[PDB]
Structure formats: C-alpha cells, structure tokens
C-alpha cells in the first residue's frame, strides 16, 4: 500500500539553509503530483509548494515564493524541498503529501494540469524549527 | 512493456498523456537513457498505417 | 485572495450524540471541497473528497452536503473513534486554503 516517509528536517540557524527529503513506495511515483504542506501550532494547516509528476512545473505559496525550491527524482522515487533564508515563522511540521489521482488525461501545458487534486495520502511529518 | 506517452487530441491546443502495453519486439530503446525513453520500431524509416 | 471560515470553532459531544460542522468560502468554488480528520500527533486523513462523495474505507455513517459557497459535515452516530480535529479544505485554487480546524471532544 502507498507508504510515504520524510527525513532531513530539524534544527537550523535562523536565516540559514535546510534541505527536506521524502521517499515513497507502493505506487508509480512517476505518475502522481507531490505537494508540501505545514502544520504550525495553533494556526491551521497551510500548503506551501507543489510539483508535477515529471518535476518540470513548480508552484509555491506567496509566503515561501522564491525562498523555497521543490524538486524530485523519479529514478530513485524521492522528493525534496530546499530551504534558503528560512525564518522563525517557518517552524512547523512539514508533511509529504501525494495527490489522489494520477496525471493521466487531457492537459494544456504540463501533464497534470487542468485537473483538481486533493491530499489523499500524507506521510508522517517531520518537525522543523529554528532558534539560537 | 507498459509504456506511457504524450499524445495529441481533437483540440489542437490540447494534449493528453496515455498508456498502453506494447510487445517488446515493437519497441526499440533510444539508448540516450536506459530503463525508459523507448521508441517504436521502424519509426526512423516510415510511419505505419493502422489497419 | 480566497479564504475560508469554519464554525463552530469547538464543541463537545458524546457517544451517539449528533453534531455537525460547517464552513464557508469567500468566493464560489462549485463543489471542490474536501474534509479531513487528524488524531493528536498523527497525520491528517482524507474523509470526504468531493462536496458529497465519501472516501473509500471510511464508515458509511459519514456524509456531507453543500455547494457553491456553503458546505456542511454530519457525523451522525458519533462513536469513540470520531473524536479528532476536522479540517475544511477547498481546492481548485492557487493556495488550496485550509479551514481553521474544529476539534470535537467528549462532554
Ligand atoms: C509529456 O510532456 C511533458 C511536457 O513536455 C514532459 O515533461 C517533461 O519531461 C522531461 C523528461 O522527463 C523533463 O525533463 C527532466 O526534468 C528534470 C528537472 O529539470 C528541472 O530542474 C533542473 C534542476 O534540477 C533544471 O536545470 C531544469 O531546467 C528544470 O527546471 C530533470 O530530472 C531531468 O534531467 C535529468 O535527466 C536527464 C535524462 O536522463 C539527464 O540528462 C540529466 O542530466 C538529468 O539527470 C540527472 O538528474 C537526475 C535527477 O536528479 C538524476 O536522476 C540523474 O542521475 C542525473 O543526476 C530532465 O531535464 C521535463 O522537466 C518535464 N517537464 C517539462 C515542463 O518539460 C513529459 O515527460 C512527457 N511525458 C511523457 C510520458 O512522454
Ligand atoms: C533505424 O533504427 C534501427 C534500430 O535501431 C537501426 O537498425 C540497427 O542499426 C544498427 C546500426 O549499428 C545495427 O547494429 C542493428 O543491428 C540494427 N538493428 C537493430 C534491431 O537494432 C537502423 O539502422 C536505423 N536506420 C534505418 C534507416 O533503419
């Protein structure tokens, strides 16, 4: 069954850099979009990034636009999220989510566009925080 | 071999990603990438007509 | 930009008690609205994907309704395994905003 795992998150100096990784198994990783979301204490969930199946098209929320960078490697069935200039407001539990339906079907530019997705499978998030 | 590939549609401005099984004899690897990046046999000589 | 509001913020119930959760969208989203539940310390789980389509594996007890701007969730016979935060999320938009999150506990 679809299993997801993420690692690499942890303590980091404020304003520095960090790298988050996520591995998956039990499905064709080269046919599902991947999204990264956070869960801060108190305040509700918040989606921060998304990447297509082939790893070409990328999109991020305005709160992390330009600062973060999402990438993937279909050969190793891994996903990554580079962090640069992270701040104290980014401390949260990052979850490695996968969309509900594969990218097959009609499309305009990228294979998975022109379709609405939702986070069906979520990996056990990893804590991320920064302090002195 | 379970192959997936892009394809055109009735709408010239739209494209679609499909998949279908292909016998290994009717597939030839491009050799630029291994484990994927396959090509239909005789594609570099003529476009076959579907019966 | 599009934003979502979820109410009631919190409520108490008991085994077999009937309660409901609802949320609204600042702009029309037709029916692209999903519901999730998250136990404390675990990752969230999908419960309802479309505005009224239940997720496979979840008990048939669960149901939802709504369209356009307002949506509602009905737990029916609350059993001990339904006590966890319920998040209202809307898709078919650039941010994919989530709800404020509502936690149902025992009275
Ligand atoms: C249907 O049509 C769509 C749309 O055209 C098409 O999507 C595109 O597919 C191609 C082929 O898979 C994608 O090209 C790959 O993209 C990624 C990422 O590239 C981005 O990121 C890098 C930085 O990381 C930027 O430099 C770059 O400009 C892009 O922004 C790469 O992984 C791929 O390159 C690797 O593979 C090549 C082929 O083997 C190698 O020559 C190359 O050196 C790279 O390999 C290295 O990196 C790998 C990943 O780390 C690693 O595994 C290797 O060992 C090695 O180290 C390649 O450029 C393209 O991005 C897709 N998207 C778009 C919008 O064009 C679908 O593929 C197509 N679908 C079907 C079924 O036909
Ligand atoms: C078209 O592609 C085929 C398949 O790659 C080519 O046929 C091969 O050519 C190489 C040349 O070194 C031979 O070693 C192989 O034995 C040939 N057969 C196969 C099955 O690989 C062919 O030459 C290409 N060109 C034309 C005009 O057909």
- Provide the β-strand partners of residue B27: B40
Collapsing DSSP to helix, strand or coil, A90 comes out as helix
Neighbouring residues of C14: CB distance < 8 A, sequence distance ≥ 6: C78, C106, C107
CA distance C88 to C101: 7
C-alpha of residue B42 to centroid of ligand 2, in Å: 9
Which one of A24, A38, A42, A45 would you mutate to disrupt binding with C, by most C Cβ within 10 Å of its Cβ? A45
Q: A13 vs A20, A117, B30, C96, CA distance in Å?
A: 15, 35, 47, 29
Which pair of tokens denotes residue C18?
Answer: 């009937």
| Resolution reading in Å | 3.1
For residues A64, A69, A70 and A73, what is the CA-based torsion angle, rounded to 10 degrees?
-170
CA distance B2 to A125: 33
A105 contact residues in B (CB cutoff 8 A)? 16-17
Taking Cα atoms as reference points, which of C35, C33, C30 lies closest to residue C20? Answer: C35
For residue B41, the distance in angstroms to the closest alpha carbon of chain A comes to 24
- In degrees rounded to 5, what are phi and psi of residue C32? -80, 80
Ligand nearest to the CA of B29: 2
For residue A14, the distance in angstroms to the closest alpha carbon of chain C comes to 25
Name the experimental technique: cryo-EM
Which pair of tokens denotes residue A62?
Answer: 């305005």
CB contact under 8 A, A116 and C32: yes
CA distance C58 to B44: 52
Count how many Cα atoms sit within 13 Å of the Cα of residue B26 in the half-sphere of its side chain.
Answer: 8
Chains near B with 3+ CB pairs less than 8 A apart are A
Collapsing DSSP to helix, strand or coil, A113 comes out as coil
Residue linked to tokens 């949260």: A92
């Amino acid at each position: 069954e679809v299993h997801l795992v993420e690692s690499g998150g942890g303590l980091a100096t404020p304003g520095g850099s960090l790298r988050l990784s996520c591995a998956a198994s039990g499905f064709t990783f080269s046919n599902y979009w991947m999204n990264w979301v956070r869960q801060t204490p108190g305040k509700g969930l918040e989606w921060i990034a998304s990447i297509n199946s082939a790893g070409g098209a990328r999109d991020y929320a305005d709160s992390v636009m330009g600062r973060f960078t999402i990438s993937r490697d279909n050969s190793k069935n891994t996903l990554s999220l580079k962090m640069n200039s992270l701040r104290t407001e980014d401390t949260a539990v990052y979850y490695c989510a996968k969309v509900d339906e594969d990218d097959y079907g009609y499309f305009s530019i990228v294979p998975g566009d022109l379709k609405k997705y939702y986070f069906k499978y979520w990996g056990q998030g990893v804590q991320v925080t920064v302090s002195s | 071999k379970n192959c997936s590939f892009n394809m055109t549609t009735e709408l010239r401005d739209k494209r679609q990603k499909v998949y279908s099984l292909f016998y290994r004899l009717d597939i030839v690897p491009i050799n630029e990438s291994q484990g994927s990046e396959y090509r239909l046999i005789n594609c570099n000589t003529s476009a076959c007509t579907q019966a | 930009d599009i934003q979502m509001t979820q109410s009631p913020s919190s409520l108490s119930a008991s085994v077999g008690d009937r309660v409901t959760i609802t949320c609204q969208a600042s702009q029309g989203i037709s029916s692209w609205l999903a519901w999730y539940q998250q136990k404390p310390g675990k990752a969230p789980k999908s419960l309802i994907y479309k505005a009224s389509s239940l997720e496979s594996g979840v008990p048939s007890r669960f149901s939802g309704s709504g369209s356009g701007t307002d949506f509602t969730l009905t737990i029916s016979s609350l059993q001990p395994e339904d006590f966890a935060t319920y998040y209202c999320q809307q898709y078919d938009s650039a941010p994919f905003s989530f709800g404020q999150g509502t936690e149902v506990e025992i009275k």
